[PDB]
Amino acid sequence: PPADGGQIKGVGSGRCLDVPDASTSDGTQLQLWDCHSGTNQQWAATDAGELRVYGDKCLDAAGTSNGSKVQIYSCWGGDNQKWRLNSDGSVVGVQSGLCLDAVGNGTANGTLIQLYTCSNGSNQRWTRT
Numbered sequence: 001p002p003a004d005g006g007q008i009k010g011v012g013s014g015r016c017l018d019v020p021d022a023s024t025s026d027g028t029q030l031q032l033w034d035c036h037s038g039t040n041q042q043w044a045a046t047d048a049g050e051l052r053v054y055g056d057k058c059l060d061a062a063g064t065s066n067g068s069k070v071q072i073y074s075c076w077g078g079d080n081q082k083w084r085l086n087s088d089g090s091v092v093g094v095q096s097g098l099c100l101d102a103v104g105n106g107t108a109n110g111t112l113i114q115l116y117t118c119s120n121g122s123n124q125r126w127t128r129t
């Protein structure tokens, strides 16, 4: 079946999880960007816990600590490519237990995305559209 990916939209910023310049390259760090219908803002949940983009790329935690980059890499089944959306709006990395976090409490276009200790601040709350 089709992916049917949807947005991951930040509550504090009103902006969407976005792969810069619609790049598909491994290791590309994510950012906030104005929400649009483009495929670089479409994130498809799977039963394996992934958030997929471009069919076979995965939202990817480069590490397990505060400030570790959130990026894309080809999907391969790693626990650092597994994510859970919680009732408090947090998107938590399964491996690390850390939250998707807009760096520095930034809201603007280009604000980078990292892992960070969960605080439930508005830069850590998300909706799926």
Ligand SMILES: OC[C@H]1O[C@@H](O[C@H]2[C@H](O)[C@@H](O)[C@H](O)O[C@@H]2CO)[C@H](O)[C@@H](O)[C@H]1O
Residues within 6 Å of the ligand: 018, 019, 020, 021, 022, 033, 038, 040
């Ligand atoms: O990174 C900012 C922004 O990039 C857009 O991609 C542009 C790209 O920057 C430009 O060089 C090219 O000519 O057109 C692309 C499509 O507009 C993304 O579309 C946007 O989502 C952001 O990711």
Ligand SMILES: OC[C@H]1O[C@@H](O[C@H]2[C@H](O)[C@@H](O)[C@H](O)O[C@@H]2CO)[C@H](O)[C@@H](O)[C@H]1O
Residues within 6 Å of the ligand: 067, 101, 102, 103, 104, 105, 116, 119, 121, 123
């Ligand atoms: O890892 C960065 C961290 O930034 C926090 O925001 C802080 C920022 O670090 C500080 O320079 C500024 O004076 O206060 C901000 C809080 O209002 C975020 O809260 C946190 O989630 C991380 O993004």
